[PDB]
Enzyme design. Structure first.
Site, mmCIF file in Angstrom:
data_model
loop_
_atom_site.group_PDB
_atom_site.id
_atom_site.type_symbol
_atom_site.label_atom_id
_atom_site.label_comp_id
_atom_site.label_asym_id
_atom_site.label_seq_id
_atom_site.Cartn_x
_atom_site.Cartn_y
_atom_site.Cartn_z
ATOM 1 N N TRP A 1 -9.248 6.216 -0.813
ATOM 2 C CA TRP A 1 -9.645 6.771 -2.096
ATOM 3 C C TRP A 1 -8.766 6.171 -3.184
ATOM 4 C CZ3 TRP A 1 -8.368 10.094 2.034
ATOM 5 C CH2 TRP A 1 -7.013 10.442 2.108
ATOM 6 N N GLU B 1 -5.062 3.372 -10.830
ATOM 7 C CA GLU B 1 -5.822 2.139 -10.649
ATOM 8 C C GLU B 1 -6.989 2.076 -11.620
ATOM 9 O OE1 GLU B 1 -6.137 0.808 -6.384
ATOM 10 O OE2 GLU B 1 -5.897 2.977 -6.078
ATOM 11 N N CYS C 1 0.823 -1.203 0.000
ATOM 12 C CA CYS C 1 0.000 0.000 0.000
ATOM 13 C C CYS C 1 0.861 1.259 0.000
ATOM 14 C CB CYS C 1 -0.949 0.025 1.197
ATOM 15 S SG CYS C 1 -1.852 1.572 1.307
ATOM 16 N N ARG D 1 -0.146 4.559 2.876
ATOM 17 C CA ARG D 1 -0.051 4.279 4.306
ATOM 18 C C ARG D 1 0.290 5.496 5.163
ATOM 19 N NH1 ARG D 1 3.978 -0.488 4.819
ATOM 20 N NH2 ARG D 1 4.553 -0.072 2.623
HETATM 21 C C1 HEC Z 1 -6.204 6.474 1.661
HETATM 22 C C2 HEC Z 1 -6.151 6.148 0.365
HETATM 23 C C3 HEC Z 1 -5.438 4.941 -0.120
HETATM 24 C C4 HEC Z 1 -4.739 4.865 -1.282
HETATM 25 C C5 HEC Z 1 -4.560 5.995 -2.266
HETATM 26 C C6 HEC Z 1 -4.223 3.541 -1.379
HETATM 27 N N1 HEC Z 1 -4.609 2.805 -0.328
HETATM 28 FE FE1 HEC Z 1 -4.094 0.810 0.117
HETATM 29 N N2 HEC Z 1 -3.944 -1.067 0.252
HETATM 30 C C7 HEC Z 1 -4.246 -1.785 1.355
HETATM 31 C C8 HEC Z 1 -3.958 -3.209 1.131
HETATM 32 C C9 HEC Z 1 -4.192 -4.323 2.121
HETATM 33 C C10 HEC Z 1 -3.444 -3.304 -0.108
HETATM 34 C C11 HEC Z 1 -2.981 -4.556 -0.823
HETATM 35 C C12 HEC Z 1 -4.171 -5.429 -1.246
HETATM 36 C C13 HEC Z 1 -3.721 -6.575 -2.128
HETATM 37 O O1 HEC Z 1 -2.695 -7.234 -1.842
HETATM 38 O O2 HEC Z 1 -4.379 -6.883 -3.148
HETATM 39 C C14 HEC Z 1 -3.433 -1.933 -0.643
HETATM 40 C C15 HEC Z 1 -2.959 -1.668 -1.913
HETATM 41 C C16 HEC Z 1 -3.007 -0.390 -2.409
HETATM 42 C C17 HEC Z 1 -2.705 -0.095 -3.756
HETATM 43 C C18 HEC Z 1 -2.290 -1.073 -4.829
HETATM 44 C C19 HEC Z 1 -3.474 -1.413 -5.735
HETATM 45 C C20 HEC Z 1 -3.002 -1.987 -7.049
HETATM 46 O O3 HEC Z 1 -3.845 -2.471 -7.835
HETATM 47 O O4 HEC Z 1 -1.786 -1.976 -7.365
HETATM 48 C C21 HEC Z 1 -2.839 1.243 -3.916
HETATM 49 C C22 HEC Z 1 -2.617 2.020 -5.191
HETATM 50 C C23 HEC Z 1 -3.225 1.784 -2.670
HETATM 51 N N3 HEC Z 1 -3.325 0.778 -1.731
HETATM 52 C C24 HEC Z 1 -3.452 3.127 -2.466
HETATM 53 C C25 HEC Z 1 -4.808 -1.364 2.571
HETATM 54 C C26 HEC Z 1 -5.395 -0.126 2.700
HETATM 55 C C27 HEC Z 1 -6.321 0.271 3.718
HETATM 56 C C28 HEC Z 1 -6.829 -0.590 4.811
HETATM 57 C C29 HEC Z 1 -6.980 -0.167 6.066
HETATM 58 C C30 HEC Z 1 -6.647 1.603 3.456
HETATM 59 C C31 HEC Z 1 -7.590 2.494 4.225
HETATM 60 C C32 HEC Z 1 -5.926 2.004 2.315
HETATM 61 N N4 HEC Z 1 -5.174 0.957 1.889
HETATM 62 C C33 HEC Z 1 -5.950 3.262 1.719
HETATM 63 C C34 HEC Z 1 -5.335 3.590 0.503
HETATM 64 N N1 V0P Z 2 1.680 -8.617 -11.274
HETATM 65 C C1 V0P Z 2 1.708 -7.369 -10.614
HETATM 66 C C2 V0P Z 2 2.943 -6.749 -10.466
HETATM 67 C C3 V0P Z 2 2.964 -5.515 -9.816
HETATM 68 C C4 V0P Z 2 1.780 -4.948 -9.335
HETATM 69 C C5 V0P Z 2 0.583 -5.643 -9.529
HETATM 70 C C6 V0P Z 2 -0.682 -5.025 -9.012
HETATM 71 N N2 V0P Z 2 -1.817 -5.924 -9.095
HETATM 72 C C7 V0P Z 2 -2.846 -5.468 -10.026
HETATM 73 C C8 V0P Z 2 -4.273 -5.319 -9.455
HETATM 74 O O1 V0P Z 2 -4.844 -6.621 -9.295
HETATM 75 C C9 V0P Z 2 -5.355 -7.014 -8.046
HETATM 76 C C10 V0P Z 2 -5.651 -8.358 -7.793
HETATM 77 C C11 V0P Z 2 -6.161 -8.693 -6.532
HETATM 78 C C12 V0P Z 2 -6.383 -7.732 -5.525
HETATM 79 C C13 V0P Z 2 -6.086 -6.395 -5.792
HETATM 80 O O2 V0P Z 2 -6.276 -5.368 -4.824
HETATM 81 C C14 V0P Z 2 -6.198 -3.988 -5.232
HETATM 82 C C15 V0P Z 2 -6.408 -2.953 -4.074
HETATM 83 C C16 V0P Z 2 -6.499 -3.324 -2.706
HETATM 84 C C17 V0P Z 2 -6.685 -2.356 -1.692
HETATM 85 C C18 V0P Z 2 -6.782 -0.961 -2.020
HETATM 86 C C19 V0P Z 2 -6.970 0.065 -1.036
HETATM 87 C C20 V0P Z 2 -7.061 1.407 -1.447
HETATM 88 C C21 V0P Z 2 -6.945 1.683 -2.868
HETATM 89 N N3 V0P Z 2 -7.032 3.019 -3.340
HETATM 90 N N4 V0P Z 2 -6.764 0.736 -3.777
HETATM 91 C C22 V0P Z 2 -6.687 -0.580 -3.348
HETATM 92 C C23 V0P Z 2 -6.509 -1.590 -4.343
HETATM 93 C C24 V0P Z 2 -5.568 -6.030 -7.057
HETATM 94 N N5 V0P Z 2 0.527 -6.844 -10.160
#
Ligand code: HEC
Ligand code: V0P
Ligand code: HEC
Ligand code: V0P
Ligand code: CL
Ligand code: CL
Lengths: 362, 362
Positions: B237, B242, B65, B68
């Site tokens: 958000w 994404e 993330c 964070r």
């Molecule tokens: C505040 C805005 C916020 C943004 C911007 C944010 N997150 Fe995350 N975020 C995560 C987790 C857990 C993952 C990884 C999920 C996974 O492995 O698929 C993640 C993954 C992401 C990703 C990767 C998604 C992708 O497809 O590559 C992004 C971008 C991201 N966060 C941005 C827990 C959180 C939580 C939980 C309390 C909150 C709130 C949160 N995140 C808030 C936010």
């Molecule tokens: N091979 C690879 C190599 C590098 C990066 C990636 C990224 N993987 C692509 C997206 O495919 C998935 C599949 C399963 C789960 C998933 O969780 C996305 C997620 C989770 C929590 C969030 C919290 C806040 C926020 N704003 N966004 C969030 C997005 C994504 N893939």
């Protein structure tokens, strides 16, 4: 034990190499002569066939390389006979000329005498045979900051740069026995340079950007069956993103992105405008267009990714285990638009291969 | 042994949690009551203060993330008192409403009753509370292909989609004891959607693209001190990439890049034109512009990377060891233009944290 480690690497390389060449029958008698030669001299000398194929296997095993599809067409030049500074310099001049090939770049490696017992016969100081100098004093940033330490080392040896942004560094290398390296200016007739223009935007010429045609990495160690070829410069052709996304774009390199945004007519004030991303695309389009217009080989990261998928398929078709470094294989522009982004790779190190080694200047 | 593993995770979480809250003195007496409660009931119940901070630590430890920095401002809603389907549904409706907050998105998590002895009290089937359905029969690709299996499962339960490209999936979840889940249509008044327009190119509206305002991940397990909260939907958000670089761009998603290239007036024929990269930038610019114009929270990948560097600095300032997944932290657009690309991260898993779990539909 030093006589042991080489015998182990030789038994692994010769068996694998002769099997791939259809010479599996000649295996056992070749290592018999090898095991003797090691017992007597402490080392052994590859055949021209082993050296050529060994250098091709080393390219095939380079986890970070996206251009490995053409590993088998590598042009290997055996220069293990070199003994003098003039021979080294001429062999390096020849490498530049034959690899450049008037723009139709030939992937080439020149192989110099290997290390004896850790003692190098020739020690190349250039990171690439053709590269631009860099200067930092004053607060003046001139040229390529990545070449700052090497440039300062060259200037202690009597060389002096004109302090343009694109000074060609001289060849610099040290021979066994000598305390200090020699240096030789590059003949401008050997070095192709490409001025960077944009296909649509005429003002792009105002940036006065350019790059050299051929990247010839010259500071890596080729390891083939326990023999350490510390001096073996090699080249492919550029992938466009190496020039447009890193060399000319990085803040610690030429840092041209806000100048690019200015000449393409967009503002560089708000992150949400994605002006850096937009400038990166137009600069990379300009790099590809400029190399293609001049007739210098280059590949875009999409085509290169397609070629690497064929290398993945060819590997499984041949029963070879594929290794790769995901963090380096993905291109720095639109990485998710390539198949590489969406799969995993085993980053295991297989030999023969190319390895880093300590710089003599720092 | 199952009574052992929880006692070990509880002693690690409570000590770390109470130390961060300035309640280190209250530590030893709290685990005394915990050690008893486990001996008697086989589990233990977190305080509201432990549950809130534990969910914040879990966000702080999410290696993948980039957002964070704001871990400590997470809005935690304790819904461990829920017993009926109507309570689950209303709590989910409330989460959507309070997290949306008329567009000024509040990072929020609703925490439902945890697993007893591996038995879930509530089993959420949605991957996100708000997501679009997807259909594949014929050779018709309609909607979001990533939602194809869930959509087919919902339609076995009596639900039927209008088969637009943006059908809102219903909430779907199963309660303990019931053989099959229930489903409830989302009230359209709760769901903010953003139509995608371009700031400069009026023809971009012809694509008729849109996305929902709030991504509310609802299928991950929150683990706090050995207690397994399998149902605890959370939201931040969006980062623009994404939506613009994956959801609307991937070939296995909405696959809009060649339609984008058409409406922005460039050809999609030659790799060397970098039309995909150019289309990706303009689509991502459109996403950010459209969310900002409507008043829905969103962050661009540059700003987000800057915020994450402050999280890196805050971590070292507080003496906390920083963990991260480089392959997920780099953005899919211009990753080398962020500091993240140019450093390494330890991908060690620290608890509390959020984890994947098996889908009940497949
Ligand atoms: C505040 C805005 C916020 C943004 C911007 C944010 N997150 Fe995350 N975020 C995560 C987790 C857990 C993952 C990884 C999920 C996974 O492995 O698929 C993640 C993954 C992401 C990703 C990767 C998604 C992708 O497809 O590559 C992004 C971008 C991201 N966060 C941005 C827990 C959180 C939580 C939980 C309390 C909150 C709130 C949160 N995140 C808030 C936010
Ligand atoms: N091979 C690879 C190599 C590098 C990066 C990636 C990224 N993987 C692509 C997206 O495919 C998935 C599949 C399963 C789960 C998933 O969780 C996305 C997620 C989770 C929590 C969030 C919290 C806040 C926020 N704003 N966004 C969030 C997005 C994504 N893939
Ligand atoms: C034929 C054209 C060709 C292309 C295109 C090509 N290579 Fe590589 N390539 C490598 C090695 C070794 C690395 C990794 C070097 C390192 O770790 O810094 C590499 C890395 C790369 C990289 C990563 C550079 C970066 O900054 O991310 C690219 C791109 C690449 N190769 C493309 C050995 C080779 C050799 C040697 C025989 C040849 C020829 C070669 N490569 C030919 C090619
Ligand atoms: N943090 C990260 C994360 C992911 C990727 C990267 C990439 N690292 C940036 C470039 O920095 C260096 C530093 C040292 C050596 C070096 O070797 C480039 C090279 C080598 C052989 C080539 C052969 C053919 C060809 N066309 N190009 C080549 C390029 C690059 N960094
Ligand atoms: Cl380079
Ligand atoms: Cl999403």
């Amino acid at each position: 034990e030093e006589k042991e480690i080489l015998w182990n690497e030789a038994k692994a390389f010769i068996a694998a190499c002769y099997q791939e060449l259809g010479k599996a029958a000649e295996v056992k008698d070749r290592l018999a002569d090898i095991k003797s030669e090691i017992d007597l001299t402490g080392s052994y000398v590859h055949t021209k066939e082993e050296l050529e194929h060994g250098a091709k296997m080393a390219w095939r095993n380079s986890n970070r390389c996206i251009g490995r599809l053409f590993w088998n067409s590598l042009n290997v030049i055996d220069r293990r006979d070199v003994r003098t500074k003039e021979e080294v310099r001429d062999a390096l001049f020849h490498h530049i000329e034959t690899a450049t090939n008037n723009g139709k770049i030939r992937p080439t490696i020149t192989i110099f005498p290997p290390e004896e017992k850790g003692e190098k016969q020739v020690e190349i100081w250039n990171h690439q045979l053709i590269r631009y100098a860099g200067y930092e004093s004053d607060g003046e940033r001139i040229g390529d900051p990545a070449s700052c330490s090497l440039t300062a080392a060259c200037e202690e040896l009597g060389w002096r740069g004109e302090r343009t942004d694109f000074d060609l560094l001289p060849l610099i290398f040290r021979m066994k026995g000598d305390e200090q390296p020699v240096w030789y200016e590059l003949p401008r007739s050997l070095v192709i340079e490409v001025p960077i223009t944009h296909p649509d935007i005429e003002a792009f010429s105002d940036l006065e950007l350019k790059w050299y045609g051929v990247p010839i990495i010259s500071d890596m160690k080729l390891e083939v069956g326990g023999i350490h070829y510390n001096a073996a410069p090699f080249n492919g052709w550029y992938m466009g993103t190496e020039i447009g996304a890193r060399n000319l774009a990085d803040e610690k390199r030429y840092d041209k992105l806000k100048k690019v945004a200015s000449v393409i007519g967009i503002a560089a004030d708000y992150n949400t405008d994605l002006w850096k991303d937009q400038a990166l695309v137009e600069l990379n389009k300009a790099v590809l267009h400029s190399y293609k217009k001049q007739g210098v080989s280059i590949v875009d990261h999409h085509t290169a990714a397609s070629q690497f998928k064929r290398f993945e398929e060819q590997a499984e078709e041949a029963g070879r285990k594929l290794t790769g470094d995901w963090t380096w294989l993905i291109p720095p522009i639109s990485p998710a638009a390539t198949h590489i982004f969406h799969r995993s790779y085993d980053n295991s190190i297989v030999k023969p291969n190319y390895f880093y080694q300590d710089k003599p200047y720092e």
